[PDB]
Amino acid sequence: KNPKSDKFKVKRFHHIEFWCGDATNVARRFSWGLGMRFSAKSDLSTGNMVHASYLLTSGDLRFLFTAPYSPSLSAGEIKPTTTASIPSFDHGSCRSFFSSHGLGVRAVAIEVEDAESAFSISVANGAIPSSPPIVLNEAVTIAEVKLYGDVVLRYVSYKAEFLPGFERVEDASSFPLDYGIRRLDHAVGNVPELGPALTYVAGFTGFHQFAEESGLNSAVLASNDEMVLLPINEPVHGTKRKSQIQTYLEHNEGAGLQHLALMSEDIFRTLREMRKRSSIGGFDFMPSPPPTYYQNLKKRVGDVLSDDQIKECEELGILVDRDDQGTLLQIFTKPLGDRPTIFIEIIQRVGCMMYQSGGCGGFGKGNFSELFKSIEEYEK
Amino acid sequence: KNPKSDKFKVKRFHHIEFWCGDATNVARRFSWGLGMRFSAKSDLSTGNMVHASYLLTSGDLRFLFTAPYSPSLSAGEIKPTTTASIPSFDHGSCRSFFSSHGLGVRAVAIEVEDAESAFSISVANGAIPSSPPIVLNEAVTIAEVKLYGDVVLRYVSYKAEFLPGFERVEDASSFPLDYGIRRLDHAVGNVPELGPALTYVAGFTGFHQFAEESGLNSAVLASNDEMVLLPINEPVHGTKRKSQIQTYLEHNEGAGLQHLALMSEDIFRTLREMRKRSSIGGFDFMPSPPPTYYQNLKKRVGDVLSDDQIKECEELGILVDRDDQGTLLQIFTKPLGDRPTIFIEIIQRVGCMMYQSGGCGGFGKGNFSELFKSIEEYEK
Ligand SMILES: CS(=O)(=O)c1ccc(C(=O)[C@H]2C(=O)[C@@H]3CC[C@@H](C3)[C@@H]2O)c(Cl)c1
Ligand SMILES: CS(=O)(=O)c1ccc(C(=O)[C@H]2C(=O)[C@@H]3CC[C@@H](C3)[C@@H]2O)c(Cl)c1
Ligand SMILES: [Co+2]
Ligand SMILES: [Co+2]
């Protein structure tokens, strides 16, 4: 069931913003590891004396990396005279966020019809305000409310190129890398208590619940067309193996964004390219499932994937799950930075062709059992 | 003249330590950009609950990247029970350093005969103590004194593999990159006042002055065999173009390390490999000199480099200088991170063959005039 209860018009995920100590080094690492090109900048060279912000893109996926300069460079500014291009930025908030949580996601941004209306309706329905609607160059409106922990949900709306004050990047610094990633599929938060987090977020958005030991309980919130997807996890205590959700909360100093799932139009090519680069500056992947997992795929998805395609999954360590509507291929990176907190998922979905419906095939919850069974039966 | 006045036995540069917000991302970027391999680690996986430290090597060059974890992970520890592998590390100091200066060098480390003797003699001769001698696993002694700003000179001495508590890296995570870099040639500091900085450092080391508008004044301190080389710069005010030393001091919030010069055994190969990677996660280089600079090289160094070798310098943007003893080839990167502060120099020296004497060919001061002349005569 989908009551289509969104309290304001939501379009698609727009961008993800990482708060960094040094934006240059994180952005360069991510560009090479994920195949994203440098597409826009706001920094000293563009007149921004407050923060350095670099935008990477791959298809519709937008990753923004931001770090503060010395406050001394902008000590004479006030908000009405700021040279910041993101008016919600604050030196103290950014430094506090990074000292507390390490490298991670500050903003999950969605494009909406009217960011001021979305902010007003959200706050009227219980959202904790974080940054009020600000109109940039009479062209783009941006506003922010608290999502969970120190993560904000950022609303962006456009009258009619990322944000005013950003400049497109010099051709020579813009190498056209592309490993096949095309958009953000979902963004997942870890919280101490799932119930209160769901009630809060669904309360102010009108997002509905998307239709679905482990060490976790989870639920997924979704917009009207189910293209904005926000799963949330809580830990389950007292399990044999300690909950990875609880480990996250300890190392992150509380709730925050756990993973970003990036849709690829060719997951085989994406994983070939990313794995070639794992040990030369890119991203590492979690240990691959044993061969028994891939033998068991024939009975599970032999009507969807050929043997050669199953063998390709095995060569790349790709996992496969299926619900009643479609099939998904997925794989997980090791943590993106020093702490065992945020990681990336690469996903591609098969089925639900109408365009493809959001969330086609689910989120891979069936792979908790299948991985487990595989490992025990591989002990053999 | 070389009075050989070192107050303790100094061997060679040992390592450079960067203090980072996220050590993983900086280390991965530097590994790919410079061709350095991952060789050692001290982090959660090795039992270190305090800091994450990753060692890259190329030949004898050792770059260490360190960032703090959440203090909560080590809140029950005291110094006598620490899980830190570098006992001088402090969460507050590291966070303060990074918030103040951004990504940069915390420690210039030299290997000495006896780190406790070096510390004691240094402090008896005016060095400001930073971390007292600590013996690690009865095998390695480490001590630190203030050099300039928040940069320390670190003494390391070995009884007889980087440091105890570090583990060698998994073969699969250790890709054998190598672009030809072999050792640290010199490390350069920027200070507000050159005179007092020289008197302080030469006072406690016994290092001697190495034998030698612009916007700077400089002088070089050197150990007995002139293999440890520490140039220091101060700004010159009131010049037409504002001093780049003063820009550094403003953006860095004071004195600190300006550049690291890395010797290559094949500067042509190093620059081919680094330039191939500039726009795919590596390092950018400063704008190349105009063709008039390379025409003028024939009269300056035509007895040292062939025409083809001069053309190779031109293809790669390499600069050339010469003194009375030898010739040097050099080139400079753009800043390594967000702020216009620290950068890298790649160098290779020709001549002074006895082994090669330290500092053979100088430091390129003659290139301030030659670049200037080149640009004016290229206006032509
Ligand atoms: C094969 S598996 O390694 O056990 C495995 C399988 C699927 C995932 C996900 O992507 C998750 C989500 O997206 C939603 C949030 C909680 C649920 C749903 C999942 O855990 C992960 Cl993290 C690990
Ligand atoms: C051709 S140039 O771009 O004008 C140019 C040429 C040489 C250098 C150096 O390496 C320096 C040093 O190593 C020592 C410290 C101050 C002196 C000596 C130099 O400035 C630099 Cl930074 C830029
Ligand atoms: Co997922
Ligand atoms: Co130099």
Print the SS3 string covering chain A. CCCCCCCCCEEEEEEEEEECCCHHHHHHHHHHHHCCEEEEEECHHHCCCCEEEEEEEECCEEEEEEEECCHHHHCCCCHHHCCCCCCCCCHHHHHHHHHHHCCEEEEEEEEECCHHHHHHHHHHCCCCEEEEEEEECCCEEEEEEEEECCEEEEEEEECCCCCCCCEECCHHHCCCCCCCEEEEEEEEEECCCHHHHHHHHHHHHCCEECCCCCCEEEEEEECCCCCCEEEEEEECCCCCCCCHHHHHHHHHCCCEEEEEEEEECCHHHHHHHHHHHCCCCCCCECCCCCHHHHHCHHHHHCCCCCHHHHHHHHHHCCEEEECCCEEEEEEEECCCCCCCCCEEEEEEEEECECCECCCCCCCCCHHHHHHHHHHHHHHC
Report whether residue A7 contacts ligand 1, using a CB cutoff of 6 Å.
Answer: no
A-B contacts (CB, under 8 Å): 126
Residues preceding chain discontinuities in chain B with C to N over 2.5 Å: 160, 212, 354
Mapped onto helix, strand or coil, the DSSP state of residue B201 is helix
Phi and psi of B343, rounded to 5°? -140, 175
State which residue of chain A sits closest to B173, comparing Cα positions: A279
Taken in order A71, A75, A79, A83, the sign of the CA dihedral is negative
Kindly determine whether residue B338 and residue A251, on different chains, have CB atoms separated by under 8 Å: no
Q: Which ligand is nearest to the CA of A232?
A: 1
CA A66 to chain centroid: 16
Q: How far is the CA of B230 from the centre of ligand 1 (A)?
A: 52
Q: Yes or no: say if A9 and A112 are a contact pair by the CB < 8 Å rule.
A: yes
State which residue of chain A sits closest to B103, comparing Cα positions: A22
Q: Yes or no: say if B43 and B178 are a contact pair by the CB < 8 Å rule.
A: no
Distance CA A118, CA A8 (A): 6
Q: Which ligand is nearest to the CA of B231?
A: 2
Say if strands B181-190 and A208-209 run parallel, antiparallel, or are unpaired.
unpaired
Of B24, B72, B280, the CB nearest to A253: B72
Q: How far is the CA of B345 from the centre of ligand 4 (A)?
A: 6
Residue closest via CA to ligand 1's atom 20 equals A365
The number of residues in chain A equals 380
Say if strands B61-68 and B10-19 run parallel, antiparallel, or are unpaired.
parallel
Report whether residue A345 contacts ligand 1, using a CB cutoff of 6 Å.
Answer: yes
Amino acid found at B302: G
Say if strands A181-190 and A256-264 run parallel, antiparallel, or are unpaired.
antiparallel
Kindly determine whether residue A32 and residue B31, on different chains, have CB atoms separated by under 8 Å: no
Q: Which ligand is nearest to the CA of B343?
A: 2
List the 1-60 stretch of B: residues with Cβ below 8 A of A. 20-26, 28-33, 38, 43-44, 52
List the 135-154 stretch of B: residues with Cβ below 8 A of A. none
Q: Which element (helix H / strand E) includes B290?
A: none
Residue with tokens 């043997």: A307
Q: Is A78 exposed, middle or buried (0-12, 13-18, 19+ CB in 10 A)?
A: exposed
Tell me which residue of B257, B261, B320, B196 sits closest to B61, measured CA to CA.
B261
Tokens of B294: 């390379």
Residue closest via CA to ligand 1's atom 4 equals A368
* Residue A273 is assigned to a ligand binding site: no
**Best interface-test mutation with A: which of B18, B22, B63 has the largest number of A CBs within 10 A?**
B22
Q: Yes or no: say if A334 and A285 are a contact pair by the CB < 8 Å rule.
A: yes
Residue closest via CA to ligand 2's atom 12 equals B363
Give, to the nearest 10 degrees, the angle between helix B23-34 and helix B267-277. Answer: 130
Task: Give the bridge partners for B195, in sequence order.
Answer: none
Tokens of B90: 């402090």
* Residue B259 is assigned to a ligand binding site: yes
Of A21, A33, A280, the CB nearest to B177: A280
**What protein residues have CB closer than 5 angstroms to ion ligand 4?**
B 261, 345, 363
Q: Supply angle C-alpha B336, B218, B225, rounded to 5.
A: 90
Architecture of domain A10-173: Roll (3.10)
Q: Is B47 exposed, middle or buried (0-12, 13-18, 19+ CB in 10 A)?
A: exposed
Tokens of A167: 């400049």
Of A22, A43, A177, the CB nearest to B280: A177
B-chain CB neighbours of A22 within 8 Å are 20-21, 26, 102-103, 337-338
Q: Which element (helix H / strand E) includes B299?
A: helix B297-301
How many C-beta neighbours within 10 Å does residue A138 have? Answer: 8
Q: Yes or no: say if B97 and B252 are a contact pair by the CB < 8 Å rule.
A: no
Say if strands B129-136 and B140-148 run parallel, antiparallel, or are unpaired.
antiparallel
Distance CA A243, CA A213 (A): 9
Q: Resolution in A, one decimal? A: 1.5
Radius of gyration of chain B (CA): 21
Amino acid found at A248: Y
Residue closest via CA to ligand 1's atom 6 equals A364
Q: Which residues line ligand 2 (CB under 6 A)?
A: B 186, 188, 218, 231, 233, 259, 261, 319, 332, 345, 363-365, 367-368, 371
Tell me which residue of A5, A1, A34 sits closest to A18, measured CA to CA.
A34
CA-CA-CA-CA dihedral for A38, A41, A43, A45, to nearest 10? 90
Does the beta carbon of A287 lie under 8 angstroms from any beta carbon of chain B?
Answer: no
Taken in order A224, A107, A182, A317, the sign of the CA dihedral is negative
Q: Is B100 exposed, middle or buried (0-12, 13-18, 19+ CB in 10 A)?
A: middle
A306: CB partners within 8 A, 6+ apart: none
Residue closest via CA to ligand 2's atom 8 equals B364
State which residue of chain B sits closest to A38, comparing Cα positions: B279
Q: Yes or no: say if B257 and B109 are a contact pair by the CB < 8 Å rule.
A: no
Phi and psi of A248, rounded to 5°? -55, -50
B-chain CB neighbours of A26 within 8 Å are 22, 25
Of A23, A32, A70, the CB nearest to B251: A70
Of A31, A174, A337, the CB nearest to B22: A337
Does the beta carbon of B303 lie under 8 angstroms from any beta carbon of chain A?
Answer: no
Taken in order B192, B198, B200, B204, the sign of the CA dihedral is positive
Q: How far is the CA of A222 from the centre of ligand 3 (A)?
A: 14
**DSSP state letter for B313:** H
State which residue of chain A sits closest to B283, comparing Cα positions: A28
* Residue B186 is assigned to a ligand binding site: yes
Give, to the nearest 10 degrees, the angle between helix A115-124 and helix A194-205. Answer: 130
Alpha helices in B150-243 (DSSP H): 194-205
Does the beta carbon of B254 lie under 8 angstroms from any beta carbon of chain A?
Answer: no
Kindly determine whether residue A280 and residue B22, on different chains, have CB atoms separated by under 8 Å: no
Q: What is the homologous superfamily of the domain A181-379 according to CATH?
A: 2,3-Dihydroxybiphenyl 1,2-Dioxygenase, domain 1 (3.10.180.10)
Residue with tokens 């902010």: A119
Kindly determine whether residue A21 and residue B98, on different chains, have CB atoms separated by under 8 Å: yes
Radius of gyration of chain A (CA): 21
Residues carrying CATH 3.10.180.10, chain B: 10-173, 181-379
Mapped onto helix, strand or coil, the DSSP state of residue B75 is coil
Distance CA A105, CA B232 (A): 39
What distances in angstroms separate CA B157 from CA A182, A379, B110, B142, B266, one per listed residue? 52, 48, 9, 7, 30
Mapped onto helix, strand or coil, the DSSP state of residue B298 is helix
Say if strands A326-332 and A343-351 run parallel, antiparallel, or are unpaired.
antiparallel
Amino acid found at A92: G
Distance CA A138, CA A116 (A): 13
Amino acid found at A154: R
Phi and psi of A301, rounded to 5°? -140, 20
Pocket-testing residue among A329, A365, A373, A375, ligand 1, by greatest number of atoms within 8 A of Cβ: A365
Distance CA A188, CA A231 (A): 5
Residue with tokens 């709730």: A255
Q: Yes or no: say if B340 and B103 are a contact pair by the CB < 8 Å rule.
A: no
Tokens of B362: 């100088």
Tell me which residue of A322, A333, A335 sits closest to A363, measured CA to CA.
A322
Tokens of A374: 């595989």
Q: Which element (helix H / strand E) includes B131?
A: strand B129-136
Q: Yes or no: say if B14 and B112 are a contact pair by the CB < 8 Å rule.
A: no
Distance CA A310, CA A298 (A): 8
How many C-beta neighbours within 10 Å does residue B237 have? Answer: 10
Mapped onto helix, strand or coil, the DSSP state of residue B99 is helix
B28: CB partners within 8 A, 6+ apart: A29, A33, A281, A282
CA A53 to chain centroid: 18
Tell me which residue of A174, A164, A132 sits closest to A36, measured CA to CA.
A174
Report whether residue A248 contacts ligand 1, using a CB cutoff of 6 Å.
Answer: no
Q: Which ligand is nearest to the CA of B285?
A: 2
Mapped onto helix, strand or coil, the DSSP state of residue B289 is coil
Of A25, A29, A31, the CB nearest to B337: A25
B270: CB partners within 8 A, 6+ apart: B35, B179, B180, B181, B264, B346
Kindly determine whether residue B253 and residue A70, on different chains, have CB atoms separated by under 8 Å: yes
A178: CB partners within 8 A, 6+ apart: A35, A37, A58
